[PDB]
Amino acid sequence: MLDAFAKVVSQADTKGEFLSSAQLDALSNVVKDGSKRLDAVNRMTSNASTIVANAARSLFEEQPQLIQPGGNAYTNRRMAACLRDMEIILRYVTYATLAGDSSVLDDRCLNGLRETYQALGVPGGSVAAGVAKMKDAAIAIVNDPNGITKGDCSALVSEIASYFDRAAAAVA
Amino acid sequence: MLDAFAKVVSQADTKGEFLSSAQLDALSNVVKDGSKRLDAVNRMTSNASTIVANAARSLFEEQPQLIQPGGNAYTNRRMAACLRDMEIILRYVTYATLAGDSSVLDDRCLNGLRETYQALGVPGGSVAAGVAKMKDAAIAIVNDPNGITKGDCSALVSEIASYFDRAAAAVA
Amino acid sequence: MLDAFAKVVSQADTKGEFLSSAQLDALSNVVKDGSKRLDAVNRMTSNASTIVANAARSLFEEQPQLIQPGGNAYTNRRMAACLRDMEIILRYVTYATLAGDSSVLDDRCLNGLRETYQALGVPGGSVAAGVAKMKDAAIAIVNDPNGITKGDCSALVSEIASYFDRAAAAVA
Amino acid sequence: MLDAFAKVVSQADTKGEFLSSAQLDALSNVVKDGSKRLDAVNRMTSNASTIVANAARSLFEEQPQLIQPGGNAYTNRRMAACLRDMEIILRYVTYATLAGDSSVLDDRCLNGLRETYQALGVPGGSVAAGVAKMKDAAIAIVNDPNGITKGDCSALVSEIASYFDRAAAAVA
Amino acid sequence: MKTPITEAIAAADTQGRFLSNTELQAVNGRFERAAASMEAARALTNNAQQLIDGAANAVYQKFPYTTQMQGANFASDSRGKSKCARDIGYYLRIITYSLVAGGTGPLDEYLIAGLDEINRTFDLSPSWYVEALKYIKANHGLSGQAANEANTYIDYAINALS
Amino acid sequence: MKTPITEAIAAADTQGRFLSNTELQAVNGRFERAAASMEAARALTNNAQQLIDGAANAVYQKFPYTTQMQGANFASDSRGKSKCARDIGYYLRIITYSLVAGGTGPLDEYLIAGLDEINRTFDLSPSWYVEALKYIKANHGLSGQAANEANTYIDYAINALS
Amino acid sequence: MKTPITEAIAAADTQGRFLSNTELQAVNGRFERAAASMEAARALTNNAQQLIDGAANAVYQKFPYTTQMQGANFASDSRGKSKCARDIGYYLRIITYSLVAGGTGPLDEYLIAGLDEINRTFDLSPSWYVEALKYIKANHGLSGQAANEANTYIDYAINALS
Amino acid sequence: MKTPITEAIAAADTQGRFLSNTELQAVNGRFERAAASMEAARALTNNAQQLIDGAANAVYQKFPYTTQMQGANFASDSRGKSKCARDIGYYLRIITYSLVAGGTGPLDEYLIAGLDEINRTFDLSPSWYVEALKYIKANHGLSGQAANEANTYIDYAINALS
Numbered sequence A, B, C, D: 001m002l003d004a005f006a007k008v009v010s011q012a013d014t015k016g017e018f019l020s021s022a023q024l025d026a027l028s029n030v031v032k033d034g035s036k037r038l039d040a041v042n043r044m045t046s047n048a049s050t051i052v053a054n055a056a057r058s059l060f061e062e063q064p065q066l067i068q069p070g071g072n073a074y075t076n077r078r079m080a081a082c083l084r085d086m087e088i089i090l091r092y093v094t095y096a097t098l099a100g101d102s103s104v105l106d107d108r109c110l111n112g113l114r115e116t117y118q119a120l121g122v123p124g125g126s127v128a129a130g131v132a133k134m135k136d137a138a139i140a141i142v143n144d145p146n147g148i149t150k151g152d153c154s155a156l157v158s159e160i161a162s163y164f165d166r167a168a169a170a171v172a
Numbered sequence E, F, G, H: 001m002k003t004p005i006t007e008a009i010a011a012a013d014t015q016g017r018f019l020s021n022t023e024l025q026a027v028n029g030r031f032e033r034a035a036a037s038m039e040a041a042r043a044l045t046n047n048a049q050q051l052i053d054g055a056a057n058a059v060y061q062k063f064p065y066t067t068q069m070q071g072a073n074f075a076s077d078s079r080g081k082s083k084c085a086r087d088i089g090y091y092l093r094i095i096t097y098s099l100v101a102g103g104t105g106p107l108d109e110y111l112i113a114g115l116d117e118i119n120r121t122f123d124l125s126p127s128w129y130v131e132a133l134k135y136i137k138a139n140h141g142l143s144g145q146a147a148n149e150a151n152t153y154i155d156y157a158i159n160a161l162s
């Protein structure tokens, strides 16, 4: 897999170039925001249960046929499997956030996943909706100004939202 | 596999319903006829040899070409195999009778059996005739009023006849 | 292993004679009290955790160095191991109670247990004390006249206590 | 294996009490000097070949029969084996230095080493001398005040020397 | 599905033989106890709504904070109380399933599997449901062996949460 | 030995667990059938000598050559009559063992094992003992489920010879 | 034992090599976080008794039946109150162990292992201790990364009970 | 690519779990050292041509014969000196790669692998490049921890040639 530094270094090696001041400054910004990035990762993992819970609640309100008899999340087995998928996608999003690059999310999670869902009979659009609602809950937890040194985390927040939207577009 | 209680419970679970008074009363009737059901199973197993014998006798009278030279039950090997098949089908019928549901009979015995016989060159129609004659002998043994507390076993008898007819229709 | 019927049948086969009317009467009394025996086994298994808890509470009250630093049941590891031991011994006692014979308890649980405990440094005397307290709690729960039909269970209680004392004497 | 924190926590768990303010103060001083400790480990590992070379030069100067025909370090095989031994012992000393505890050095390297050397015919006294000379070279390199921030590393140097003397005493 | 009857039949089938006298004795025991089993199932199904609402109220009284604290996992509004009654109904329904089938199969497959992850994810304290089950156990109104059957399966539900 | 109770206990001990409600139901089936089993055992033991002698005479009436032909394996003289009575006594004794134990264990262990080679070596026709057991079945004086149990294990002995 | 430093050393020793710069960076991360870890340990140890008593009273206020119902597993009398205070003390003591060690090692080893069977046997509801740890988290008086570390390991204890 | 961050993530993924507090501490150590790492990388990239030409000249002075002897592997003409400056630039560029990534991954994959065969085939003495690296190490002008980072990766390059 790659992190941000590894992606820049691989692209540089392919061209046989030293890093340009653009790339140097970008990676220096990553290094200086490292503490906020660790804060985002820690806040997402420490509240993974609540993120999954809020997303699933909003989804099941929006699509109640999911949790009624005949629904695709009705029995205990299907419900637990659905929550497992939610936490899996969230875990790979946290991986991508720590890495600063979506390589691990695509290669180890998103690839072939739409085909897997369409073979299992799981509504990919509903999974994508749940992923978006996970995005909303996770951004709400990340930007919560309580108990943290005040600052601007809008760049990290947009990066995390991009990872979530990439996850959602891979199954819809 | 399923028994009667398990079939009703699975159908209830699929709909997310409590059992209706219909299902409760049906299963209570099964429970109260349990002793006669055990009597039917015990009488069929304890006289399995005589049931197979009477059925095969009637069949071979009806179709004597079966036990003449060139017949499909002529040599000792073929004859023993034919009796083995008779006892196999009877054993799975007894299973279904104890269970109060034909699931074990279909899944573990009847499925793919017509194809097996047509690949082996065994006359499926003759097997079905022998199965019907087994049904007659077994009902005669079940309804025999001697040595048993007198009562009505007509419901169990129709159930057992249905299992036998299901077995016969799977090879004809 | 042996149950009561099996022990009597083995002793009668080794002598080559029919069962005397005495042995027939004893085994018929076992059959008559079979429902009481099932009650004892059911109450002891479905209250197993409560029995173990009461015994352990008493044992730690009178031997408090067991749950104090340096005690053989202080840490979470050794505490859980002691509770596992007591639940194991109670389980084998319920086995013997269902069988109406101590052979399973002797052969599968007690034989070689004192050697195990002294090789481990587990004090066998306190294990025997805990077993006796398990006996007291179990007999209290079995003799509880609420929720059950009034009747004499003194013989059954004495048999269960004999099993408990056999267990306590095998490690004391 | 243990580090300083782990050793203190094990000794406090075996007594069942909180850490006294003395132990808290000692471990907090370890944390404050952690950067000095990393400096010592880094300097000892990145100068390992120089440390081994200085020690070996001194050892062969004062015991020249070691590198003369018939000496236990004469041929290329035995010379390379002696250098491997010294690099191994220095590596385990750096392990103990990072851990702030000698348990790894005792258990994984020193335990049984004198028996190995006397079974091999390797003179343990000269091995201990070489270890002491490694100590001198390593402490010289660690205490070098150039290229680093001025500060007191006497406690760390004494701890490292204690590890070196523990190693030398295990084969002497 | 795992039932005593299906287990007897599977044991007979593995050895390719007819049902022995021992297996017939076992199935007879199942049938004999099935009277109490069906009595308890019919009782728990008729008194369904009464027992569900009583158990919910028992949990609310025993744990008052579940009717006061704000939060989606609590029952401080109508949505929470509807969800809680629905959960208790799920538990009771599957317990009746087990009573009907004669074994823990329905409880093992339809309820217990995945239950811990459901409770951890949505922050539903298992002790709430333990208390609900304790109320249902103390207030079914059954007597004798039907009571004993209902109690064994309610207790099996309790042990899964513990 | 192989009894229903020992089999249930062994199943529970293999999984290192307490006894389940299914197993307690099966043991209750054994206990409920044990009343008829013990009545049949008591009857067959009390009328043991009458049944043995009647069965020997039934064998003689059905296969008269056994009383006529000379040769050690026949009952032409008193020694043969006594050996045959002893044999039928062994059969009945072990059938009562099985009724007591509640399973085919004693019959599988004490009688049927090696029976084929015994009968082949001493030229004893199994149909003799089949007829003896048929007489015993027709003349034990039991009615109902006690008779059903006695006939279950007697037919089990009959099929071991066929 | 399982500390970050011991894990780095074991990784280096498995490959029979000196410590790498990656491993030294990781150990430096441990050392930089250890300042907050040690501040949190010191605070929780100094205010140990106040925190234990406050957590016990929070449990009582939240679950009042624990002070009212008779039975050995409750805190209706002085013995129960003292047992509960001792338990919360064990929890906090081991949490400080983990803060000192810099990992979940002590919590995995000294508390969580066997905790489930302990609580099942003596009928102690895990939600009690969850609430106690929530109080401790809300009342340790730490600010910043020391509070973050304390809450990390307290939530680790909370999830072991859920 | 192997980086400390990717190694942390791969360790988390192998066990199918979220990132632990220990892995977060390790990645924090990487981030903390990354300030010095990026400082050294920026310095070595700005002073690229100066350091390359200075190191080439250092090799030429230390080994005068490389500017005198005829032969394609020596630098007695313009082609050789261009090739030598290009090689030293390759070395320095990959060292900056490692500094940026935070580990020896880029050096292991982009430079060291196959380096011995390249040097043996074209008769390029590794000691030439050792001297070039020693000059770069003695003349980057960095101070403190950025200097220490640059030095560790230059030394790692030196050990590959030794």
Ligand SMILES: *[C@@H](C)[C@H]1/C(=C/c2[nH]c(/C=C3N=C(/C=C4\NC(=O)C(CC)=C4C)C(C)=C\3CCC(=O)O)c(CCC(=O)O)c2C)NC(=O)[C@@H]1C
Residues within 6 Å of the ligand: A032, A033, A035, A036, A038, A039, A040, A042, A142, A143, A144, A145, A148, A149, A150, A151, A152, A153, G033, G144, G145, H021, H024, H025, H028
């Ligand atoms: C954006 C999510 C919110 C935010 C972020 C923010 N945090 C800090 C300061 C610090 N964050 C940390 C975090 C960690 N260090 C570690 O080792 C680990 C893993 C174990 C973590 C999670 C630290 C140590 C600091 C410095 C001390 C402090 O508490 O200040 C800042 C300010 C400093 C900086 O940005 O570099 C910021 C901005 N603040 C918000 O308002 C966002 C909602």
Ligand SMILES: *[C@@H](C)[C@H]1/C(=C/c2[nH]c(/C=C3N=C(/C=C4\NC(=O)C(CC)=C4C)C(C)=C\3CCC(=O)O)c(CCC(=O)O)c2C)NC(=O)[C@@H]1C
Residues within 6 Å of the ligand: B032, B033, B035, B036, B038, B039, B040, B042, B142, B143, B144, B145, B148, B149, B150, B151, B152, B153, E021, E024, E025, E028, F033, F144, F145
């Ligand atoms: C229908 C086949 C015929 C019939 C059935 C019938 N039987 C009974 C009464 C009883 N049957 C049993 C049978 C068993 N109990 C066991 O444990 C086992 C397996 C080891 C068996 C096979 C028992 C115990 C009884 C009760 C005692 C008795 O002999 O009565 C009845 C009457 C009671 C009822 O139906 O519940 C009936 C009707 N009678 C017929 O006439 C049919 C030909």
Ligand SMILES: *[C@@H](C)[C@H]1/C(=C/c2[nH]c(/C=C3N=C(/C=C4\NC(=O)C(CC)=C4C)C(C)=C\3CCC(=O)O)c(CCC(=O)O)c2C)NC(=O)[C@@H]1C
Residues within 6 Å of the ligand: C066, C071, C072, C073, C077, C078, C079, C081, C082, C083, C085, C086, C088, C089, C108, C109, C113, C116, C120, C122, C123, C126, C127, C130
């Ligand atoms: C409380 C009762 C006392 C005590 C108990 C204690 N026991 C052990 C460790 C072991 N216990 C057993 C016993 C059995 N294993 C079996 O399979 C069976 C029956 C089939 C039995 C009876 C064994 C084998 C061990 C050693 C292996 C293991 O732990 O599984 C311990 C742990 C001792 C230790 O960790 O060093 C303890 C503490 N402790 C007390 O204080 C009570 C007197």
Ligand SMILES: *[C@@H](C)[C@H]1/C(=C/c2[nH]c(/C=C3N=C(/C=C4\NC(=O)C(CC)=C4C)C(C)=C\3CCC(=O)O)c(CCC(=O)O)c2C)NC(=O)[C@@H]1C
Residues within 6 Å of the ligand: C032, C033, C035, C036, C038, C039, C040, C042, C142, C143, C144, C145, C148, C149, C150, C151, C152, C153, C156, E033, E144, E145, F021, F024, F025, F028, F029
């Ligand atoms: C001494 C322990 C106490 C006592 C025992 C007692 N039990 C019964 C009667 C019954 N017990 C049961 C329980 C079961 N039957 C089964 O098949 C199973 C396995 C699932 C169980 C757990 C049953 C069904 C009965 C019969 C129905 C009834 O309610 O009686 C009695 C009654 C006397 C008898 O032997 O029939 C007694 C006395 N009763 C006490 O008061 C003792 C404290």
Ligand SMILES: *[C@@H](C)[C@H]1/C(=C/c2[nH]c(/C=C3N=C(/C=C4\NC(=O)C(CC)=C4C)C(C)=C\3CCC(=O)O)c(CCC(=O)O)c2C)NC(=O)[C@@H]1C
Residues within 6 Å of the ligand: D066, D071, D072, D073, D077, D078, D079, D081, D082, D083, D085, D086, D088, D089, D108, D109, D113, D116, D120, D122, D123, D126, D127, D130
């Ligand atoms: C110089 C220090 C002295 C000396 C050294 C010497 N050592 C050996 C051979 C061996 N050295 C070891 C030591 C270790 N192996 C390990 O794994 C560890 C720590 C985990 C240690 C400390 C061993 C096991 C051997 C034998 C097997 C092997 O060679 O790998 C030799 C070679 C002896 C021979 O070839 O006969 C030598 C020469 N020689 C001197 O003169 C110095 C006093």
Ligand SMILES: *[C@@H](C)[C@H]1/C(=C/c2[nH]c(/C=C3N=C(/C=C4\NC(=O)C(CC)=C4C)C(C)=C\3CCC(=O)O)c(CCC(=O)O)c2C)NC(=O)[C@@H]1C
Residues within 6 Å of the ligand: D032, D033, D035, D036, D038, D039, D040, D042, D142, D143, D144, D145, D148, D149, D150, D151, D152, D153, D156, G021, G024, G025, G028, G029, H033, H144, H145
């Ligand atoms: C005694 C050995 C000599 C001594 C030690 C000393 N070191 C420092 C300060 C620092 N040392 C480092 C080195 C590292 N930090 C890491 O994370 C890693 C792993 C990659 C390493 C190798 C760092 C970063 C610092 C802080 C920055 C700085 O330049 O100070 C000091 C300063 C005092 C302190 O503890 O902070 C000292 C005294 N200095 C000497 O003069 C002794 C000879």
Ligand SMILES: *[C@H](C)[C@H]1/C(=C/c2[nH]c(/C=C3N=C(/C=C4\NC(=O)C(CC)=C4C)C(C)=C\3CCC(=O)O)c(CCC(=O)O)c2C)NC(=O)[C@@H]1C
Residues within 6 Å of the ligand: A053, A057, A060, A067, A074, A075, A076, A079, E059, E060, E066, E067, E072, E073, E074, E075, E076, E079, E080, E081, E083, E084, E085, E087, E088, E090, E091, E110, E111, E115, E118, E122, E124, E128, E129, E132
């Ligand atoms: C009542 C005891 C307490 C309580 C109730 C409560 N439950 C929920 C939400 C959910 N409950 C479940 C449980 C199950 N669904 C199944 O299929 C099965 C197996 C049969 C079980 C056990 C689930 C999955 C959810 C979430 C999804 C859904 O709504 O179905 C809530 C709502 C929490 C939320 O975030 O939506 C509540 C309030 N809370 C209390 O305070 C009562 C004491």
Ligand SMILES: *[C@H](C)[C@H]1/C(=C/c2[nH]c(/C=C3N=C(/C=C4\NC(=O)C(CC)=C4C)C(C)=C\3CCC(=O)O)c(CCC(=O)O)c2C)NC(=O)[C@@H]1C
Residues within 6 Å of the ligand: H059, H060, H066, H067, H072, H073, H074, H075, H076, H079, H080, H081, H083, H084, H085, H087, H088, H090, H091, H110, H111, H115, H118, H122, H124, H128, H129, H132
């Ligand atoms: C300068 C230190 C001394 C020296 C330089 C010199 N080098 C070459 C030719 C080659 N150098 C390389 C090295 C690499 N190519 C790669 O891709 C990598 C990995 C990043 C390395 C390390 C190679 C492959 C060649 C041959 C093919 C090519 O030209 O690229 C030469 C020319 C030798 C020749 O025969 O062409 C020279 C002169 N010689 C000196 O005297 C300097 C002291």
Ligand SMILES: CCC1=C(C)/C(=C/C2=NC(=C\c3[nH]c(/C=C4\NC(=O)[C@H](C)[C@H]4CC)c(C)c3CCC(=O)O)/C(CCC(=O)O)=C2C)NC1=O
Residues within 6 Å of the ligand: A066, A071, A072, A073, A077, A078, A079, A081, A082, A083, A085, A086, A088, A108, A109, A113, A116, A120, A122, A123, A126, A127, A130
């Ligand atoms: C590491 C990468 C990885 C992924 C991504 C993954 C997903 C995944 N989810 C599955 C099932 C499932 N996934 C769901 C989820 C859903 N049902 C709904 O109604 C919702 C829309 C949604 C929850 C938000 C369900 C219900 C199943 C079970 C399907 C079934 O049993 O019929 C399955 C196959 C069956 C199973 O394992 O249970 C896979 C492989 N497994 C992996 O290893």
Ligand SMILES: CCC1=C(C)/C(=C/C2=NC(=C\c3[nH]c(/C=C4\NC(=O)[C@H](C)[C@H]4CC)c(C)c3CCC(=O)O)/C(CCC(=O)O)=C2C)NC1=O
Residues within 6 Å of the ligand: B066, B071, B072, B073, B077, B078, B079, B081, B082, B083, B085, B086, B088, B108, B109, B113, B116, B120, B122, B123, B126, B127, B130
């Ligand atoms: C558990 C489910 C199961 C079934 C159902 C089963 C049936 C079965 N019967 C077979 C043969 C046979 N079946 C028969 C039976 C018949 N011939 C006649 O004339 C009659 C119509 C009829 C007797 C009523 C014969 C003769 C064979 C041997 C065919 C041959 O040797 O040519 C064979 C393959 C060859 C062999 O095994 O001997 C199978 C698989 N085996 C199983 O395991």
Ligand SMILES: CCC1=C(C)/C(=C/C2=NC(=C\c3[nH]c(/C=C4\NC(=O)[C@H](C)[C@H]4CC)c(C)c3CCC(=O)O)/C(CCC(=O)O)=C2C)NC1=O
Residues within 6 Å of the ligand: F059, F060, F066, F067, F072, F073, F074, F075, F076, F079, F080, F081, F083, F084, F085, F087, F088, F090, F091, F110, F111, F115, F118, F122, F124, F128, F129, F132
């Ligand atoms: C429980 C296991 C067991 C069995 C089954 C058993 C049977 C048995 N019956 C025997 C003899 C005999 N059994 C008979 C009985 C018969 N001949 C007739 O004509 C009658 C019709 C028929 C009676 C049904 C006779 C006549 C002998 C003596 C044959 C001889 O001595 O060679 C013998 C030869 C050894 C001896 O004399 O004891 C054996 C082993 N012994 C055992 O330990």
Ligand SMILES: CCC1=C(C)/C(=C/C2=NC(=C\c3[nH]c(/C=C4\NC(=O)[C@H](C)[C@H]4CC)c(C)c3CCC(=O)O)/C(CCC(=O)O)=C2C)NC1=O
Residues within 6 Å of the ligand: C053, C057, C060, C067, C074, C075, C076, C079, G059, G060, G066, G067, G072, G073, G074, G075, G076, G079, G080, G081, G083, G084, G085, G087, G088, G090, G091, G110, G111, G115, G118, G122, G124, G128, G129, G132
């Ligand atoms: C560190 C590993 C470890 C743990 C976790 C531990 C817990 C523990 N708490 C116990 C008792 C107890 N714990 C409590 C506490 C509670 N009851 C209430 O109502 C309160 C709300 C609640 C406090 C949160 C009580 C009352 C008892 C006594 C129960 C009894 O004696 O049966 C017991 C039974 C043995 C004894 O008395 O010591 C254990 C093993 N012991 C250990 O070595």
